[PDB]
Amino acid sequence: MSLKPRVVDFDETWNKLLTTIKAVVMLEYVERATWNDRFSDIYALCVAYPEPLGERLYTETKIFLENHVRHLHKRVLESEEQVLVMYHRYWEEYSKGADYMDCLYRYLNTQFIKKNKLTEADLQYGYGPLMEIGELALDMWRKLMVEPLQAILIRMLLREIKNDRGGEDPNQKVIHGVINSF
Amino acid sequence: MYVKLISSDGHEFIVKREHALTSGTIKAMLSGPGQFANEVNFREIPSHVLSKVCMYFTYKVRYTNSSTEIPEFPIAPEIALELLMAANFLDC
Amino acid sequence: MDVFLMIRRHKTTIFTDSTVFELKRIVEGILKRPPDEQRLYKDDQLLDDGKTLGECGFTSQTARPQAPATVGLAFRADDTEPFSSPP
Amino acid sequence: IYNLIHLDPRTREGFTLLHLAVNSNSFPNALVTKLLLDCGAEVNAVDNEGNSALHIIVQYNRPISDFLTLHSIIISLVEAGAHTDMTNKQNKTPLDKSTTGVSEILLKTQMKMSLKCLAARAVRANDINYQDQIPRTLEEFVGFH
C-alpha cells in the first residue's frame, strides 16, 4: 500500500534528487524508469508524520538554482568578442530547463504554495514573497545575467543593426532570439 | 492511441489515451524526457484500487452533458479510504 | 453503444465498448495475434462465431460501466488470479 | 473599501458583509455583489448555522421576481470559487434545501463531479475512524464534504 504518512530523512532523499535535478536544467538523458519513480518521493516529503518538510525543500532548491545561474555568469563575462552566440546557446537550453522541471514540482505548486501567497486583489490597489517553482527560475535570469550585463548586449546590437543598414549579412536567428528573450 | 498502466502488485491494465488524460499527474508523467519512445510504472498502488480508478473514467466520459438522470457509483465501505488517498495522488 | 466488458486474460485486462469475429479482430489489433490462434472460453463454454453478442447471451441492461462483465479469452495456447484480497 | 474588508465586521449571528448583501433585510443587487467579490472577500464563509452564500439565495421564494437577476449572483458565486456540497449544522445540501423547483434546475447546469467528492461521502455516512490515518490536509476536507 505504502501511501500512508511515514517518517523520512531529508539527507537521503535530497542527496538522490540532486543528481536527476541537475541533468534536467541542461539537456541530457535520464532513464524512463527514474523519471516515473521520483514522482513518489516529492510526495512523501510533503506528508511526514513528525512535521512537514516542504519549506526546507523550497529554501534548498532556491540555493541550488543560484549557483547554476552564477557560474554561467562567470563563463560568459569572460567570453571575448563573441558574447552574442554564447548568450544564445545557454538561453535556449535554460528556457527548456524550466518547464521540464515545473512538472516535477506540481504538488508543491498546487497544495503548499498558492495557499499562502498573495492574491491578485492584494497585488492591485496596494495594501495586501512566495512564488511558484518554474517561474522562480525566470527571476534569477533577470537579476544576475542581463542586468549586470546590459551594456555590451545593447552596444554590440545597435552597431550590427547599423552595419546591416549599411550593407551586411547578419544571422537573423541569432539576433531574433536575443531580442525575443526580453 | 493506447497507454499501459503497471501496478505495484504486477497486474497490467490498458485503456485508451483520451480516456486517461482526466488526471493531471498522468499527463505530467507523459510530458518531458518521459515521452517513452507507453507504459507508466506506479510504485505504491495496489490492484483493487487501480481497477476502480480505471472504471471511473468511462463512467465520467459517457454520462456527461446528458439529460438522462445519472445513476450512483457503487463504492464498498471496506476500501473507501484507499480511493481517497489515491485520488489525492492522481488528482482525479 | 450498449455494451462495456473487459477482455480479461492471464496477467492482463483490455477495456473496449457485432459478432465475435470483430472482437477477435480487435484483440488482434491490440495484442498482434492471429485471428484463428485466439478464440473465446466465455463462461466455461466456447462461444460460436457469426452470431452477434446479443444472441450469445449478454444483455445491455445488465452490462453497464459500473459493473462490466468478464469475458475469458485465454486461448493464446496454440490456436485454441483474483485481483487482490482487501486488508 | 478593501481597508474595511481586510478586517471582519461580522455582526449578529456571524453574518458577513456578503451574507447581508445577498438576503432580504438589498435582497439581490447584481453590481454590489460583483464589486464586493472583486474587492476580495471569502467566497466560503461559515455562520452560526454554517450556511454559505448559496445556502441563503436558494430559499429566495420569488422566482418570478428577478428571474433575470437570480441568474447573476449564482454564476458570480460559482466562478472565482464555490463549494456546492457543504453540509451545515445538520445533514443538508444546497440542492436539498432548495424550496423552489426553479432553483433546483438552475443549479444543475454548473457543477462537476470528481472521485474525491464521491469517496468523501461514504466515509462519513458509513462512520469509521477517519482520524489520524490520513494526511493532515485531507482531514479538514473530509469534514464539510
UniProtKB/Swiss-Prot annotation, chain A:
Disulfide bridge map: none
One GO-annotated biological process of the protein: ubiquitin-dependent protein catabolic process via the C-end degron rule pathway
Keyword Ribonucleoprotein: no
Post-translational events: Neddylated; which enhances the ubiquitination activity of ECS (Elongin BC-CUL2/5-SOCS-box protein) E3 ubiquitin-protein ligase complexes. Neddylation leads to structural rearrangment in the complex that allows interaction between the E2 ubiquitin-conjugating enzyme and the acceptor ubiquitin. CBC(VHL) complex formation seems to promote neddylation. Deneddylated via its interaction with the COP9 signalosome (CSN) complex.
Keywords of this entry: Acetylation, Host-virus interaction, Isopeptide bond, Nucleus, Phosphoprotein, Ubl conjugation, Ubl conjugation pathway
Cellular localisation: Nucleus
Flavoprotein is among the record's keywords: no
GO MF assignments: protein-macromolecule adaptor activity; ubiquitin ligase complex scaffold activity; ubiquitin protein ligase binding; ubiquitin-protein transferase activity
GO CC term, one of those recorded: nucleoplasm
Family, as annotated: Belongs to the cullin family.
Written domain comment of the UniProt record: The Cullin neddylation domain restrains the RING domain of RBX1 in the E3 ubiquitin-protein ligase complex; this restraint is removed upon neddylation of the cullin.
Name assigned to this protein: Cullin-2
Source species taxonomy: Eukaryota, Metazoa, Chordata, Craniata, Vertebrata
Complete-protein stretch covered: 1 to 188 of 745
Curated annotation (Swiss-Prot), chain B:
GO molecular function: protein-macromolecule adaptor activity; transcription corepressor binding
PANTHER family: ELONGIN-C (PTHR20648)
CDD domains found in the cross-reference section: BTB_POZ_EloC
Cell location: Nucleus
Source organism (scientific name): Homo sapiens (Human)
Protein name from the UniProt record: Elongin-C
GO BP terms in the entry: protein ubiquitination; regulation of transcription by RNA polymerase II; target-directed miRNA degradation; transcription initiation at RNA polymerase II promoter; ubiquitin-dependent protein catabolic process
CC terms in the record's Gene Ontology section: Cul2-RING ubiquitin ligase complex; Cul5-RING ubiquitin ligase complex; cytosol; elongin complex; nucleoplasm
Gene3D superfamilies found in the cross-reference section: Potassium Channel Kv1.1, Chain A
Coiled coil: none
SMART domains, sorted: Skp1
Family: Belongs to the SKP1 family.
Pfam (any one): Skp1_POZ
Pathway assignment: Protein modification; protein ubiquitination
Subunit details: Heterotrimer of an A (ELOA, ELOA2 or ELOA3P), ELOB and ELOC subunit. The elongin BC complex interacts with EPOP; leading to recruit the elongin BC complex to Polycomb group (PcG) target genes, thereby restricting excessive activity of the PRC2/EED-EZH2 complex.
Tissue: Overexpressed in prostate cancer cell line PC-3 and breast cancer cell line SK-BR-3.
Keywords (A to Z) from UniProt: Host-virus interaction, Nucleus, Transcription, Transcription regulation, Ubl conjugation, Ubl conjugation pathway
Curated annotation (Swiss-Prot), chain C:
Keyword annotations: Acetylation, Host-virus interaction, Nucleus, Phosphoprotein, Transcription, Transcription regulation, Ubl conjugation pathway
Family: Belongs to the Elongin B family.
GO BP of this protein: positive regulation of proteasomal ubiquitin-dependent protein catabolic process; protein ubiquitination; protein-containing complex assembly; target-directed miRNA degradation; transcription elongation by RNA polymerase II; transcription initiation at RNA polymerase II promoter
Entry function: SIII, also known as elongin, is a general transcription elongation factor that increases the RNA polymerase II transcription elongation past template-encoded arresting sites. Subunit A is transcriptionally active and its transcription activity is strongly enhanced by binding to the dimeric complex of the SIII regulatory subunits B and C (elongin BC complex). Core component of multiple cullin-2 and cullin-5-RING E3 ubiquitin-protein ligase complexes (ECS complexes), which mediate the ubiquitination of target proteins. By binding to BC-box motifs it seems to link target recruitment subunits, like VHL and members of the SOCS box family, to Cullin/RBX1 modules that activate E2 ubiquitination enzymes. Component the von Hippel-Lindau ubiquitination complex CBC(VHL).
Name of the featured protein: Elongin-B
Native source species: Homo sapiens (Human)
N-acetylmethionine, modified sites: M1
Residue numbers bearing the Phosphothreonine modification: T80
Keyword Cytoplasm listed: no
Gene: ELOB
Swiss-Prot record, chain D:
Coiled-coil boundaries: none
ANK repeats: 13-45, 49-86
Top-level division of the source organism's lineage: Eukaryota
Tissue and organ expression note: Widely expressed. Highly expressed in testis. Weakly expressed in other tissues.
Locations listed in the record: Cytoplasm; Nucleus
Role this protein plays: Substrate-recognition component of a Cul2-RING (CRL2) E3 ubiquitin-protein ligase complex of the DesCEND (destruction via C-end degrons) pathway, which recognizes a C-degron located at the extreme C terminus of target proteins, leading to their ubiquitination and degradation. The C-degron recognized by the DesCEND pathway is usually a motif of less than ten residues and can be present in full-length proteins, truncated proteins or proteolytically cleaved forms.
Subunit and partners: Component of a CRL2 E3 ubiquitin-protein ligase complex, also named ECS (Elongin BC-CUL2/5-SOCS-box protein) complex, composed of CUL2, Elongin BC (ELOB and ELOC), RBX1 and substrate-specific adapter FEM1B. Homooligomer. Interacts with PPM1F and PHTF1. Interacts with the death domain of FAS/TNFRSF6 and TNFRSF1A. Interacts with CHEK1. Interacts with NKX3-1.
Family per similarity comment: Belongs to the fem-1 family.
Protein name stated in the entry: Protein fem-1 homolog B
Organism in which the protein naturally occurs: Homo sapiens (Human)
Chain's gene name: FEM1B
Coverage span on the entire protein: 471 to 627 of 627
